[PDB]
Amino acid sequence: FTEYAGAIKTITSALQFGMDALERGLVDTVLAVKLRHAPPVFILKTLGD
């Protein structure tokens, strides 16, 4: 029983891993979308006037 129930703790923690490494995928790609459309200050400041 302690071999079974210690192997179901492996496969959940191998699969909590799978979802919670995909919530990092949101935060990566959303930040990488912002950096593709973020020109620097010195270019954009004089265009702001």
């Binding site: 923690s13 891993f17 919670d20 490494a21 990092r24």
Partner: protein
């Protein structure tokens, strides 16, 4: 003629729990440590991606 003398006491010092150095260490009293051979701590660091 019975002669008496003057003795000065040993100047005592603050014990270890009443010094502020024990904020840096965690104190346990292991009664029989001369029987111990080794002691270990085993970390298991899971890593997300």
């Amino acid at each position: 003629e019975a002669l008496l003398g003057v003795y000065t006491n040993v100047v005592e010092f603050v014990k270890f729990l009443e010094t502020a150095l024990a904020a840096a260490c965690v104190n346990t009293e292991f009664k029989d440590l001369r029987r111990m051979i080794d002691g270990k701590i085993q970390f298991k660091i899971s890593m997300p991606t």
